[PDB]
Ligand binder design. Structure first.
Ligand SMILES: Cc1cc2nc3c(=O)[nH]c(=O)nc-3n(C[C@H](O)[C@H](O)[C@H](O)COP(=O)(O)OP(=O)(O)OC[C@H]3O[C@@H](n4cnc5c(N)ncnc54)[C@H](O)[C@@H]3O)c2cc1C
Ligand SMILES: Cc1cc2nc3c(=O)[nH]c(=O)nc-3n(C[C@H](O)[C@H](O)[C@H](O)COP(=O)(O)OP(=O)(O)OC[C@H]3O[C@@H](n4cnc5c(N)ncnc54)[C@H](O)[C@@H]3O)c2cc1C
Lengths: 363, 357
């Protein structure tokens, strides 16, 4: 008999598990496979990168990462790979240069420090980078983490604090008896609880029907490649119109990512492998003579409302939702967990439904 | 040309690589397979758990003092966390005979002996509630701990690569090139690697190369089989030790249990009887393991020396030939000082004692 059962053991559900259990709530994670089985183990873990109410949530989440990391390491033994060596936006042609200069110029007015670099000035800092790069924007405060490690950290933190983790357990439905959540119906039987959180990434749609038929998430498949190198090829991640090359602990380079909407398919097509690597060669040619390590596919949970659903059901008491983070669920995992636990404890109002899901279209 | 070529990409070779490169030396590492692919990936990473005047004793003491701040240094430099944990280790007893020998180790080991104390079976179960009713008591060592050996090994080696070392994985050293009684390089499977110094750190395979010291010298593998299970429950905060057998928790709900001892074999398969015996012994110490989740099993070749002690030092007659292999069951614990000693010795800031005693 739990305070909250959490449906899904990705970063988002594990983050929620962490913050609740930390505050003495008896919590259960129910996950149909394993912790970090899906988007959260496929993600490149980049933090930061137009305006909107997410930008501010992101900024708030971003700032939690330094202390969160230290805490998690100390408590669980897992280091999440938090790194802050900055991130480059690169440009290889003039359209791209201007696109980047314009982003920077609106960004700068918000207080975020960033410097425009010349191709030669980039190459002083990152010498393996292509002669084709003509400029770039450097953000010294950006960084990244190891998505699966952060995920695993949250979940074991939760367990240490008393959370029960049920892997290989699928939630078919929520048990609402008198317009109240009384439990959850799983493949391994009933789990009694007083509150539920839907954190089912790309699979949340059916359970989101309790809120509304049109509420939902769908998978946007992304394929990525990883290579190893004995050279110091990149110090910091490089970005180019969503495409990225990122270092990780241990001389690993992670490179992606394709976009294939509305499929749960986790195979990798050759063409994607070829397309990804050829693009990487124009940025960073030495990757030709690196060591192939792996390739994989992950399922970004797009929102039907183009913003994650984070909130309490207005009628059915104890029924919560927290999914649809799409491309920024690693970045936002800390703010999401913190918020959800505040909301579950009555410490915050149910205002993030309103704020994130309505967009004024006219006027 | 390199100031030093290091033969072996284990924790020992990679320590030496770290400490050296960190002092502006140009180092190559030459490794048959890949970094940390033998004993150093297989090890349980326990620290500290010899007679009192054995120098390894002073060395082990110094190794343990370098470890905390080294862990920070490697993390912040390479981004690799070595799993340094200092929550202690319990030497358990299940017989009254064991209790005696344990109390005996404690009493006559108080060489400022890590402020260790006796706990009753009941007081241990307070501290660790899944441990067996069968344990009478144990000696808790508060300043005892453990690392993740494969991780420490990787840290060290990336540390050196960041400091300019060239890692030649997938490269076997056949022989050491000696022209005019000085070392000019190392003859490998790929090409010739030109260096002014070499360090034999080839663990259990060092024997042929050690013959340039004395045909009497050599190392050999002592096979060890280990089992790893995963768990959602909190079965242990700190490792338990018992006459070489150990149950150790690792970050991420993992529990590695071992180990077996099969001497004079390089063979890396695991015999079912070893799994059967390790697990059955484990069940008496921590019954919940019955319903944990099986993860994996493996073997590693502990590098025993012909002389039952590491070879660490410089060749008296041959200019620039060094050795540092054969740490048997303490290779992880001594990787920091083995590295620091070896680099101090190459820079002529340390005398050549260990080769004598
Ligand atoms: C290629 C790629 C690169 C990315 N890069 C970045 C990046 O650089 N920065 C960034 O912030 N984000 C990135 N992301 C996004 C990030 O992966 C997601 O936004 C985030 O992982 C979503 O986490 P989640 O827990 O909601 O989803 P998931 O990790 O998919 O978790 C959902 C979990 O719920 C479980 N589940 C579903 N239904 C049920 C049920 N009925 N019962 C029980 N369990 C259930 C599933 O097993 C799954 O484990 C990237 C994604 C991809 C694919
Ligand atoms: C089961 C087990 C548990 C253990 N537990 C502990 C513990 O709890 N605490 C502890 O302190 N220690 C422990 N050890 C000991 C520790 O594993 C070793 O002492 C440690 O590996 C250090 O050895 P090394 O680096 O010399 O050996 P290795 O890791 O074997 O390194 C030797 C390297 O040299 C390479 N090599 C060999 N020949 C050549 C050549 N011609 N050219 C190039 N490369 C070559 C090999 O490929 C190998 O990678 C344990 C060992 C085992 C097996």
């Amino acid at each position: 008999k739990y305070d909250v059962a959490i449906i899904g053991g990705g970063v988002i559900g594990s983050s929620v598990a962490h913050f609740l259990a930390e505050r003495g709530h008896k919590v259960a994670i129910v996950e149909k496979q394993s912790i970090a089985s899906e988007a959260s183990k496929a993600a490149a873990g980049l933090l930061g990168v137009a305006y909107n109410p997410l930008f501010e949530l992101a900024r708030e989440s971003r700032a939690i990462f330094p202390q969160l990391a230290a805490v998690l390491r100390e408590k669980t033994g897992v280091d999440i790979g938090y790194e802050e060596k900055g991130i480059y936006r690169i440009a290889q042609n003039e359209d791209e240069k201007e696109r980047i200069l314009h982003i920077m110029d609106w960004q700068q007015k918000t207080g975020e420090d960033s410097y425009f670099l010349t191709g030669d000035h980039v190459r002083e800092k990152e010498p393996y980078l292509s002669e084709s790069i003509i400029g770039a924007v450097y953000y010294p405060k950006d960084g990244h983490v190891i998505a699966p490690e952060l995920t695993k950290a949250f979940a074991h933190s939760a367990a240490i604090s008393g959370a029960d983790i049920y892997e290989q357990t699928e939630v078919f439905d929520i048990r609402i008896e008198n317009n109240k959540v009384t439990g959850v119906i799983t493949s391994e039987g009933i789990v009694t609880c007083e509150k539920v959180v839907i954190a089912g990434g790309s699979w949340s749609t059916k359970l989101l029907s309790y809120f509304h038929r049109d509420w939902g998430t769908y998978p946007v498949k992304g394929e990525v490649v990883a290579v190893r190198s004995r050279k110091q090829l990149l110090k910091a991640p490089i970005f180019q119109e969503r495409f990225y090359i990122t270092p990780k602990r241990g001389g690993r380079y992670v490179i992606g990512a394709t976009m294939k909407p509305h499929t749960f398919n986790k195979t990798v097509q050759p063409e994607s492998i070829t397309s990804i690597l050829e693009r990487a060669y124009t940025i960073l040619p030495a990757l030709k003579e690196a060591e192939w390590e792996s390739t994989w596919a992950g399922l970004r949970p797009q929102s039907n409302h183009e913003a994650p659903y984070m909130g309490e059901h207005e009628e059915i008491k104890g029924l919560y939702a927290c999914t649809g983070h799409y491309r920024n669920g690693i970045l936002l995992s800390p703010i999401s967990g913190q918020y959800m636990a505040d909301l579950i404890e009555g410490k915050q109002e149910n205002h993030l439904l309103d704020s994130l899901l309505s967009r004024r279209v006219l006027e």
